PDB file of C-alpha atoms and ligand atoms in Angstrom:
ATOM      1  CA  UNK A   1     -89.203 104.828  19.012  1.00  0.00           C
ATOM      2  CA  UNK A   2     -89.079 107.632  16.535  1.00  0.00           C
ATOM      3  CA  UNK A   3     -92.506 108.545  16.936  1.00  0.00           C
ATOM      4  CA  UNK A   4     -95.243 108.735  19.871  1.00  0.00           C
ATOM      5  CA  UNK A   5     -98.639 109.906  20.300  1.00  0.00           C
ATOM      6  CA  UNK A   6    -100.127 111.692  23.248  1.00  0.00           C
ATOM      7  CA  UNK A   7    -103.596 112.611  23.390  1.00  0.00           C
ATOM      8  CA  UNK A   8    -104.787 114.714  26.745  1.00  0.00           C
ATOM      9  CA  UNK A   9    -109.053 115.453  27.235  1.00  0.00           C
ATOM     10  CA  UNK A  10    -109.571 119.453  28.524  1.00  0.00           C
ATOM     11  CA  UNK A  11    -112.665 118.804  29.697  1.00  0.00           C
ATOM     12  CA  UNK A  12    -112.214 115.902  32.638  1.00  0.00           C
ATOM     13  CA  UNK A  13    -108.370 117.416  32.790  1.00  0.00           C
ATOM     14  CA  UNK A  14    -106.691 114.048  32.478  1.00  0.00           C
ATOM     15  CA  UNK A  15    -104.815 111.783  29.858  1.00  0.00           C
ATOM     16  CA  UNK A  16    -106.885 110.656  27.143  1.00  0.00           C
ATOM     17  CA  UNK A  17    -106.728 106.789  28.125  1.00  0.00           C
ATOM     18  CA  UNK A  18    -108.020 103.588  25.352  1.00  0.00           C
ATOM     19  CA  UNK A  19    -108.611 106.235  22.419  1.00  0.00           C
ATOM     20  CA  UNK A  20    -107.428 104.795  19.337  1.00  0.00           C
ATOM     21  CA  UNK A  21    -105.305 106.069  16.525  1.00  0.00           C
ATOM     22  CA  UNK A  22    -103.936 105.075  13.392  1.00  0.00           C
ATOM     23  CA  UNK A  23    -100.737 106.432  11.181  1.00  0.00           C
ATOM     24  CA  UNK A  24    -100.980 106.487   7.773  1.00  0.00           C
ATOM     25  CA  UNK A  25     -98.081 106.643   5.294  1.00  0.00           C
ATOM     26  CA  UNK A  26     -99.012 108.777   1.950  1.00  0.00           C
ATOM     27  CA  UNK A  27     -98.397 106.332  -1.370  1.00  0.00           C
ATOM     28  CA  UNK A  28     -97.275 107.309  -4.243  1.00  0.00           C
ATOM     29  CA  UNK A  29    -100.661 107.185  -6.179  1.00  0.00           C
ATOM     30  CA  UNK A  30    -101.552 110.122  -3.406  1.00  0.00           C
ATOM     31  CA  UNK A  31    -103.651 107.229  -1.369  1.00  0.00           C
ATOM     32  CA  UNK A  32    -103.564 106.796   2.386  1.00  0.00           C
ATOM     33  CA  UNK A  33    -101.522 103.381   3.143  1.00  0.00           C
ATOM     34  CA  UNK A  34    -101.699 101.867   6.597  1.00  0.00           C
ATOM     35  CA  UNK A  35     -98.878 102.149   8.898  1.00  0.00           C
ATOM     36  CA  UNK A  36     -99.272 102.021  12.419  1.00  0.00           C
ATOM     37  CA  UNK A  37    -102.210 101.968  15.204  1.00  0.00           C
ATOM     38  CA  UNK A  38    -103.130 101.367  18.364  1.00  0.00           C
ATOM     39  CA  UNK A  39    -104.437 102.686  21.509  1.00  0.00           C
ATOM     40  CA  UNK A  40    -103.279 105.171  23.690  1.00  0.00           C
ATOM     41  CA  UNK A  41    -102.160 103.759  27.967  1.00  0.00           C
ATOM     42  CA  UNK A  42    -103.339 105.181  30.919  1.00  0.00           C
ATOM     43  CA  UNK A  43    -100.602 107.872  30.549  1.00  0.00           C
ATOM     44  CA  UNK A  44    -102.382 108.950  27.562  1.00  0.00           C
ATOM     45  CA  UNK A  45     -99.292 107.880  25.671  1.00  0.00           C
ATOM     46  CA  UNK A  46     -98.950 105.230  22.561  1.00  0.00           C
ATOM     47  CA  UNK A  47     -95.240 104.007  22.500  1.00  0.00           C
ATOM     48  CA  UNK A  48     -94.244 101.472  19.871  1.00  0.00           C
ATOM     49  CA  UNK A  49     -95.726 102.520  16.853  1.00  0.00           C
ATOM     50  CA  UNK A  50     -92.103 102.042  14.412  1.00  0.00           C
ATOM     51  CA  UNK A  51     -89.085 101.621  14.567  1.00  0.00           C
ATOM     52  CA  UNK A  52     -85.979 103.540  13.067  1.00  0.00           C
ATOM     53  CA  UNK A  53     -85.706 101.203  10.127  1.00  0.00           C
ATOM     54  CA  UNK A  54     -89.943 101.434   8.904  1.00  0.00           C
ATOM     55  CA  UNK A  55     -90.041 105.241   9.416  1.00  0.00           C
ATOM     56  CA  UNK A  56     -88.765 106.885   6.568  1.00  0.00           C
ATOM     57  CA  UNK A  57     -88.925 110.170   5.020  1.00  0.00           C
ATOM     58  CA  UNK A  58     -92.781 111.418   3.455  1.00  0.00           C
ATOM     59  CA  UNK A  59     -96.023 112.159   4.337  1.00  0.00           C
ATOM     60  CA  UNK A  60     -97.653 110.947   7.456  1.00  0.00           C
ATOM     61  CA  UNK A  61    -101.421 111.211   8.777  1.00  0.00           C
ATOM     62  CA  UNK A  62    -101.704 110.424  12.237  1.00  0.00           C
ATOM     63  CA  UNK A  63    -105.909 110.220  12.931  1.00  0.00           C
ATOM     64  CA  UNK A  64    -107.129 110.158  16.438  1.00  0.00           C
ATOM     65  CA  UNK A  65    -110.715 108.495  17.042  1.00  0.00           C
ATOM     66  CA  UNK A  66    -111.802 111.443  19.092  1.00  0.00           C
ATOM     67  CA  UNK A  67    -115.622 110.608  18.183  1.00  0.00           C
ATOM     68  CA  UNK A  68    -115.545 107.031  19.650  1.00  0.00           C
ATOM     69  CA  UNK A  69    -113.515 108.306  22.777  1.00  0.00           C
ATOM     70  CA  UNK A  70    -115.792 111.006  23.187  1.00  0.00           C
ATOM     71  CA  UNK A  71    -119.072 109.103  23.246  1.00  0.00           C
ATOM     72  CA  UNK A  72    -117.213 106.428  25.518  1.00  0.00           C
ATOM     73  CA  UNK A  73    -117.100 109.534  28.614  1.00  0.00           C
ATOM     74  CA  UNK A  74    -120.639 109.874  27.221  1.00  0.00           C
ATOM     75  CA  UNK A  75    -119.813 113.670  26.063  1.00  0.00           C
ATOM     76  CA  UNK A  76    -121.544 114.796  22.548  1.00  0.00           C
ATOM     77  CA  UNK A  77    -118.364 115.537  20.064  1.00  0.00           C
ATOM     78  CA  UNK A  78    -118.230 117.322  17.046  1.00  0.00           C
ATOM     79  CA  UNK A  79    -115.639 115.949  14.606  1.00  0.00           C
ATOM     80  CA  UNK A  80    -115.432 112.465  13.375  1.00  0.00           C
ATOM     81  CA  UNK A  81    -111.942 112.319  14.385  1.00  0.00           C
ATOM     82  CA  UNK A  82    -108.538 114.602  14.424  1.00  0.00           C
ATOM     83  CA  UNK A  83    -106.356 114.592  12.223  1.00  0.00           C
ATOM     84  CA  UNK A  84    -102.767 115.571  11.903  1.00  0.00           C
ATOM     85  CA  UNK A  85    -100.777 115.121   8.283  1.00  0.00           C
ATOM     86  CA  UNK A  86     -96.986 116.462   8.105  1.00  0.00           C
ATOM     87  CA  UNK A  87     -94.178 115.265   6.817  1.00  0.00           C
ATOM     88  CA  UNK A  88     -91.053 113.823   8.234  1.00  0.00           C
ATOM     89  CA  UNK A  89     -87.937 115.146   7.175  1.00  0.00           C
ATOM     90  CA  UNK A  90     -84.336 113.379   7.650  1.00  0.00           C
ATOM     91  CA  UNK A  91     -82.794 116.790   9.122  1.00  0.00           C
ATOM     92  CA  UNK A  92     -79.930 115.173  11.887  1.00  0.00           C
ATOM     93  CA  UNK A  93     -81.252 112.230  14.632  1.00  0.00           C
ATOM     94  CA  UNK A  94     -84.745 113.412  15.339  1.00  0.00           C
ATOM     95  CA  UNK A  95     -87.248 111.710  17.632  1.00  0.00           C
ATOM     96  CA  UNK A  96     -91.257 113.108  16.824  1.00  0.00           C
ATOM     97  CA  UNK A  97     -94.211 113.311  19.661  1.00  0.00           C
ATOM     98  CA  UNK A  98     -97.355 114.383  18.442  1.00  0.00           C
ATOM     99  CA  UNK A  99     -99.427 115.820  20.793  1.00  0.00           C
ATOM    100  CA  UNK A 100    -103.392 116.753  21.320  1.00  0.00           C
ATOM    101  CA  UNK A 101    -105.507 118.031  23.774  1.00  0.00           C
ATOM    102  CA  UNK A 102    -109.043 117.566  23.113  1.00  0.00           C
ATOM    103  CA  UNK A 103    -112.492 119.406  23.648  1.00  0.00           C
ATOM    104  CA  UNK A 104    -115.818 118.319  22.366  1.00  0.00           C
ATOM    105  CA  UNK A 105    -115.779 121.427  19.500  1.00  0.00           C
ATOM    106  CA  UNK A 106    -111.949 121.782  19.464  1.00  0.00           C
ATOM    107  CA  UNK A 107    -108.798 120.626  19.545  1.00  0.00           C
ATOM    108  CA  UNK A 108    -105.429 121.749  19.060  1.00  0.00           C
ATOM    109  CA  UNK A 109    -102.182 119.441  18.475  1.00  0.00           C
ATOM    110  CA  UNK A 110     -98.570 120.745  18.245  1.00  0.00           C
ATOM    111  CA  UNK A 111     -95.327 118.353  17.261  1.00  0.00           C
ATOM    112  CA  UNK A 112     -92.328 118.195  20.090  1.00  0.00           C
ATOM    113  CA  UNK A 113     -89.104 117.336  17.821  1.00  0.00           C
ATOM    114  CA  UNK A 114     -86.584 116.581  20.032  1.00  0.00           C
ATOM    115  CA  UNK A 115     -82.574 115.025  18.986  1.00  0.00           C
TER     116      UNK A 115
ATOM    117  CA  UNK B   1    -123.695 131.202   4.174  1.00  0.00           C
ATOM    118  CA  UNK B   2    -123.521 128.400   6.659  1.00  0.00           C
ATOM    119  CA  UNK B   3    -120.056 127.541   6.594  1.00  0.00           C
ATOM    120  CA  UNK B   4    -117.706 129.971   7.047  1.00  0.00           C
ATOM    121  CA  UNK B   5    -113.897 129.619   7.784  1.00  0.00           C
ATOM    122  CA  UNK B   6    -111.848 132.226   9.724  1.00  0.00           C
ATOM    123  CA  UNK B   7    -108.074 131.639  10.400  1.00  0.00           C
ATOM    124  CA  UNK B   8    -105.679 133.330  12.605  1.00  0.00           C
ATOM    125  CA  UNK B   9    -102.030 133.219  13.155  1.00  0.00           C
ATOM    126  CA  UNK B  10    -100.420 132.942  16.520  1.00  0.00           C
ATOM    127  CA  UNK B  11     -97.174 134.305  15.581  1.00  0.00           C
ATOM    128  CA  UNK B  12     -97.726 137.542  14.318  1.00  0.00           C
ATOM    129  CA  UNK B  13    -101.356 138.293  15.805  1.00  0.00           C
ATOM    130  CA  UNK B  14    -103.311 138.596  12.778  1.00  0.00           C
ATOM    131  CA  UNK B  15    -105.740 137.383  10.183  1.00  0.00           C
ATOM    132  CA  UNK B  16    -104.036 134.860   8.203  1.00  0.00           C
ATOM    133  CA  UNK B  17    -104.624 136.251   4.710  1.00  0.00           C
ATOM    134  CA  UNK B  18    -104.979 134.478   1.690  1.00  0.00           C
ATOM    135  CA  UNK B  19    -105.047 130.950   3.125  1.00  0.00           C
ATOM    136  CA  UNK B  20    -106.490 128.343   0.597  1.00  0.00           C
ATOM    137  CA  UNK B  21    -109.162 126.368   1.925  1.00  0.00           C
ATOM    138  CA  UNK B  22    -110.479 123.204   0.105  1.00  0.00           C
ATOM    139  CA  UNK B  23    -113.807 121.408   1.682  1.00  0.00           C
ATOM    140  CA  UNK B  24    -114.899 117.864   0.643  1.00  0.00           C
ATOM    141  CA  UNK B  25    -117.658 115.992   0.814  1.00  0.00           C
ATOM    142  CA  UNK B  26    -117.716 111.932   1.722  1.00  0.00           C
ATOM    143  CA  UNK B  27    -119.468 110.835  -1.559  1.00  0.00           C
ATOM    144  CA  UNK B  28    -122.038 107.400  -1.599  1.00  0.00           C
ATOM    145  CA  UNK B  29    -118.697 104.836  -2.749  1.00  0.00           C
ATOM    146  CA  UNK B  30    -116.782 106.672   0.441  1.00  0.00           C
ATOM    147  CA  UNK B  31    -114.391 108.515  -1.548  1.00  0.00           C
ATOM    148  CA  UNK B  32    -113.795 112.721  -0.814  1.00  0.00           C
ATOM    149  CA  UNK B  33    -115.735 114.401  -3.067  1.00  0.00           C
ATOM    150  CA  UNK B  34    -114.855 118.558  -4.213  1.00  0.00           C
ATOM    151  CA  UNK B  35    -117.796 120.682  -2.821  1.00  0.00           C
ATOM    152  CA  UNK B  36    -116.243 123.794  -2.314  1.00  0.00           C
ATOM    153  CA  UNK B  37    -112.925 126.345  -2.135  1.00  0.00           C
ATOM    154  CA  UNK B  38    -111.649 130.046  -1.263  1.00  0.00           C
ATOM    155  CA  UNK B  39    -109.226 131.595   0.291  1.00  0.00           C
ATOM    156  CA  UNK B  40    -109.424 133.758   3.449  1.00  0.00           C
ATOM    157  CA  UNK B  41    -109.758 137.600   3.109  1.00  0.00           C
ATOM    158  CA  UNK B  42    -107.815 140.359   4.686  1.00  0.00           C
ATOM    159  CA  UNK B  43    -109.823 139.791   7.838  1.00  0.00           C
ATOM    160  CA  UNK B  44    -108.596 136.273   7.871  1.00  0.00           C
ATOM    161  CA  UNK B  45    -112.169 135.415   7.175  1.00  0.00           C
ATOM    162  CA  UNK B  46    -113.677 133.216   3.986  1.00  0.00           C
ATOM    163  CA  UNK B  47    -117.074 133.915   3.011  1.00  0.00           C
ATOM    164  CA  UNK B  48    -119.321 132.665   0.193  1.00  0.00           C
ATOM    165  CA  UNK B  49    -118.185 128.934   0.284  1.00  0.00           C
ATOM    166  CA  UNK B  50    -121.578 127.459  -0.576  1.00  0.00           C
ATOM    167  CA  UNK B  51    -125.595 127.797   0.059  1.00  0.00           C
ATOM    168  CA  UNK B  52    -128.247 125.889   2.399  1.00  0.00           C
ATOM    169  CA  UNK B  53    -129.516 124.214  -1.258  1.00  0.00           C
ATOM    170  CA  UNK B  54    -125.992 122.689  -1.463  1.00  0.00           C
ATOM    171  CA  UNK B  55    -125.108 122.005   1.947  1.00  0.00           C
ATOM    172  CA  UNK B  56    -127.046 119.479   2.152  1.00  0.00           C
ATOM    173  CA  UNK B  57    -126.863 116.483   5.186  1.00  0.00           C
ATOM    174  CA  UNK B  58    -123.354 114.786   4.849  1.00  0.00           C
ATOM    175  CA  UNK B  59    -119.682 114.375   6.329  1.00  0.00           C
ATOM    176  CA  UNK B  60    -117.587 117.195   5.306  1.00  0.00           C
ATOM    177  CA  UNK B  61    -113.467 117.878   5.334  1.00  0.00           C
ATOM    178  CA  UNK B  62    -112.379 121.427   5.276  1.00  0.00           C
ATOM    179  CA  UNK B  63    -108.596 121.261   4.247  1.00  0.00           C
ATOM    180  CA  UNK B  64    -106.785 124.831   5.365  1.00  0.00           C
ATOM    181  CA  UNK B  65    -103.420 125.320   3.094  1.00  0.00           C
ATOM    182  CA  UNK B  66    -101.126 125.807   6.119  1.00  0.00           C
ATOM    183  CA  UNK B  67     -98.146 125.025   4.869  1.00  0.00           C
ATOM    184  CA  UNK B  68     -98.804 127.210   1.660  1.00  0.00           C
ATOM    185  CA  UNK B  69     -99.624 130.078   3.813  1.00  0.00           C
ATOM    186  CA  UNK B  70     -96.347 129.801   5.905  1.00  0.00           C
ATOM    187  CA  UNK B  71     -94.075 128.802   3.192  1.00  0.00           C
ATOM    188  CA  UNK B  72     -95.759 132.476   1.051  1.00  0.00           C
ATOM    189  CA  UNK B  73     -93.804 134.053   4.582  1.00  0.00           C
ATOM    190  CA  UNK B  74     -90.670 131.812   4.479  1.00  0.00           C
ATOM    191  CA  UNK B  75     -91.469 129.566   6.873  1.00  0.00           C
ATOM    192  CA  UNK B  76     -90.433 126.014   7.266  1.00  0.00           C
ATOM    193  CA  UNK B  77     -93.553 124.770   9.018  1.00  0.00           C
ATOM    194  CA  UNK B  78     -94.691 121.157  10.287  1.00  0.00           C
ATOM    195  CA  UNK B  79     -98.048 120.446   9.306  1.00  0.00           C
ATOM    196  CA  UNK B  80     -99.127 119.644   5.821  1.00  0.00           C
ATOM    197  CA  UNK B  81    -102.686 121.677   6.114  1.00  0.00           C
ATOM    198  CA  UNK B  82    -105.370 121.518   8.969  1.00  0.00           C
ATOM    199  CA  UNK B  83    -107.994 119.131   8.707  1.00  0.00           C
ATOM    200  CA  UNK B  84    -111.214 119.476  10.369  1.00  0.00           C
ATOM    201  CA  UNK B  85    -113.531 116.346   9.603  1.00  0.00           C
ATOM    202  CA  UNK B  86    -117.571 117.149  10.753  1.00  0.00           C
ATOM    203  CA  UNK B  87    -121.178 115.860  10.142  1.00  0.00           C
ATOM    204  CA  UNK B  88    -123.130 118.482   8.692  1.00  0.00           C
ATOM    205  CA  UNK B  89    -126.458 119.320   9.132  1.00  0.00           C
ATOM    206  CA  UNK B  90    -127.712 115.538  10.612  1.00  0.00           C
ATOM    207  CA  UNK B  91    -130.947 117.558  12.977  1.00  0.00           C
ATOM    208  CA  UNK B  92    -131.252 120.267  10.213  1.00  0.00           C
ATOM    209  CA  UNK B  93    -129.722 123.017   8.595  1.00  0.00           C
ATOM    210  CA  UNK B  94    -127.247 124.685  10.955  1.00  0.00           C
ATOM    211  CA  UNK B  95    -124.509 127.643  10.232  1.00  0.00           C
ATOM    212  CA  UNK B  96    -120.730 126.489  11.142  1.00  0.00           C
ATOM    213  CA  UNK B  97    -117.946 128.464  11.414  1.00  0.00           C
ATOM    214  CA  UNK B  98    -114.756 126.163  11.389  1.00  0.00           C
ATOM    215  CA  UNK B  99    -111.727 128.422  13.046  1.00  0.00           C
ATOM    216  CA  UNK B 100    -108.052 127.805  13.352  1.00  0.00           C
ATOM    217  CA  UNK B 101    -105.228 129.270  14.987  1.00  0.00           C
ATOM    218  CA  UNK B 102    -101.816 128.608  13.362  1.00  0.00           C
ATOM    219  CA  UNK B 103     -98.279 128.255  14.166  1.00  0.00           C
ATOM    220  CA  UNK B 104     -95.255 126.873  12.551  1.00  0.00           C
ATOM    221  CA  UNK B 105     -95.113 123.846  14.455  1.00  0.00           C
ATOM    222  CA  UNK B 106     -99.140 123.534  15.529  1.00  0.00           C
ATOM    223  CA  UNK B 107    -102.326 124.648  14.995  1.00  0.00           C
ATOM    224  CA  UNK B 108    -105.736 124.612  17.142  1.00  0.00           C
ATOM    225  CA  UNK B 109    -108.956 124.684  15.567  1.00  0.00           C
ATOM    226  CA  UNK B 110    -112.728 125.207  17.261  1.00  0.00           C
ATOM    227  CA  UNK B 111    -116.065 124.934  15.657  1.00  0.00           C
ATOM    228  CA  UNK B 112    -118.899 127.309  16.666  1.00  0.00           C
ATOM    229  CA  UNK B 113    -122.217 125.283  15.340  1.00  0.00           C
ATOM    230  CA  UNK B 114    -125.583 127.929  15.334  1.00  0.00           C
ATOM    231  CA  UNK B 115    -129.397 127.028  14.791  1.00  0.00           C
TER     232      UNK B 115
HETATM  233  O1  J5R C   1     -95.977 115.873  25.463  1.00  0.00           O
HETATM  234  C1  J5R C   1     -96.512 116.256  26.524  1.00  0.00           C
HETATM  235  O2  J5R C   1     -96.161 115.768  27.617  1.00  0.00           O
HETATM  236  C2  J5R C   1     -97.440 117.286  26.483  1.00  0.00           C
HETATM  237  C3  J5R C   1     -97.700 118.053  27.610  1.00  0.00           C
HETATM  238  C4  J5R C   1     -98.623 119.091  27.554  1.00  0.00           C
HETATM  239  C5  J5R C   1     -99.284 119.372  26.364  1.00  0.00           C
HETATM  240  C6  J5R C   1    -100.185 120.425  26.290  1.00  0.00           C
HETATM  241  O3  J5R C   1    -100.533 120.970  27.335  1.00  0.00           O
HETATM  242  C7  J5R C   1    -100.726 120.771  25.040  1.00  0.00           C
HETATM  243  C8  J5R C   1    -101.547 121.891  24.815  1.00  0.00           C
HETATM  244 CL1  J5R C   1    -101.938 123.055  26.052  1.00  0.00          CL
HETATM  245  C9  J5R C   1    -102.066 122.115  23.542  1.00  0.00           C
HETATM  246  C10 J5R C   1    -101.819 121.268  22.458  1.00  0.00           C
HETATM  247  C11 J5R C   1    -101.007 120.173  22.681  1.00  0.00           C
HETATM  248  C12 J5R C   1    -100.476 119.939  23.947  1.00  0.00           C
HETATM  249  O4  J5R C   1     -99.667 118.857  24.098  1.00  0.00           O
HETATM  250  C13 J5R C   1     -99.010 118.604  25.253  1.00  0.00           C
HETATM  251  C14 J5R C   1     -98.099 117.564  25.300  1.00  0.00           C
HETATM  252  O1  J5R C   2    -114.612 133.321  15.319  1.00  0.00           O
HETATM  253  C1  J5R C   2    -113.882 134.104  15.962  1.00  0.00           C
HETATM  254  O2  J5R C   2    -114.087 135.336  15.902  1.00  0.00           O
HETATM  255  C2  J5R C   2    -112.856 133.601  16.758  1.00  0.00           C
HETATM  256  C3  J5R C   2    -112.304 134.370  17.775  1.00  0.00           C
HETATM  257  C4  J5R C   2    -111.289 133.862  18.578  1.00  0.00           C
HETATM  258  C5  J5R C   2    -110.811 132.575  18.367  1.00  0.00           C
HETATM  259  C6  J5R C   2    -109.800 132.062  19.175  1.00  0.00           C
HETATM  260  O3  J5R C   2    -109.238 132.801  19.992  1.00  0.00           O
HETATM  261  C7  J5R C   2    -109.445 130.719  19.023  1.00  0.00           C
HETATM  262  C8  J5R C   2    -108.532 130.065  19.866  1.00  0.00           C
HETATM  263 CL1  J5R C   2    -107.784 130.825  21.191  1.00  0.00          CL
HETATM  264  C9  J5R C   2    -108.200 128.730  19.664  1.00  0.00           C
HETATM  265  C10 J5R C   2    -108.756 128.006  18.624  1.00  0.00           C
HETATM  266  C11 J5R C   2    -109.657 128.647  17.779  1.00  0.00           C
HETATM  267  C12 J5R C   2    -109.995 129.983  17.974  1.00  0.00           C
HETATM  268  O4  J5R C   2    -110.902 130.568  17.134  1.00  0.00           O
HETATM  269  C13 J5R C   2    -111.374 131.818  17.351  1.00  0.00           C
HETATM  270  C14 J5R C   2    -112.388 132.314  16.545  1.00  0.00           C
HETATM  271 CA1   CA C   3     -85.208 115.814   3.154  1.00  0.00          CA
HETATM  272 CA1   CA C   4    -130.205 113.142   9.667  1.00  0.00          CA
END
């Protein structure tokens, strides 16, 4: 599992539970390609997304459906959705957790990069 | 102007200076459309993007360079840029400032939305 997603919700101070997000790898012709999605657990947490072998060096997008998770807790939101690009560079065994914490007008997201 | 952009940085306690912003528009076939760039001032603060005749109803992207602005410091960061993905204007004109806090390895960002 080189990569995971955690989302956490600063307003009801808990995990961010059934909010969806998709992974995009960045093509050639500069396009967005599918490449992974699903939804985060009860933990907040979405384990499973690749595997060594699919997740190669490039350009990654990783957009969080904050909109639809916010108007699920019936809460008025602000963005369409997060999103978090970077790029994933071969630099020794690496293991990537992308993390955000949400508010209705705000968020902020930081990468844990662990060996 | 109602959109401004003002960007900080976390790591030195500053303005971010001269941080290229790019802000896009969702055009009628879906694709991002160019509606407006600048780069922050001295005061880490970018003025003048557009007028209330062209910021009109619509979803908007505002794109901040971060990994331009650390890599001018020689900095290895994470993130490609910042993206902050909004509906504009859908009761009526309002003024938005988009704001963002930046480190090497994240980045928060908060919208402050006035009538
Ligand atoms: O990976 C985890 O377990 C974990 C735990 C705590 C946080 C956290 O508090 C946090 C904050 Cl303030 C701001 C932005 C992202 C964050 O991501 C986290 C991730
Ligand atoms: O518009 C301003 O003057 C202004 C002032 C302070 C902040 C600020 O501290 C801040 C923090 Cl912690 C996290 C995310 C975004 C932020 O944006 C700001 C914007
Ligand atoms: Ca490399
Ligand atoms: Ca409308």
């Amino acid at each position: 599992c080189p990569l995971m997603v955690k989302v956490l919700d600063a307003v009801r101070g808990s995990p961010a539970i059934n909010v969806a997000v998709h992974v995009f790898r960045k093509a050639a012709d500069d396009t967005w390609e599918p490449f992974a999605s699903g939804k985060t657990s009860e933990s907040g947490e979405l384990h499973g997304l690749t595997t060594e072998e699919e997740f190669v060096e490039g350009i990654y997008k990783v957009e969080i459906d904050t909109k639809s998770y916010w108007k699920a807790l019936g809460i008025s939101p602000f963005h369409e959705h997060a999103e978090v690009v970077f790029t994933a560079n071969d630099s020794g065994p690496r293991r990537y957790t992308i993390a955000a914490l949400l508010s209705p007008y705000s968020y902020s997201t930081t990468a844990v990069v662990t060996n």
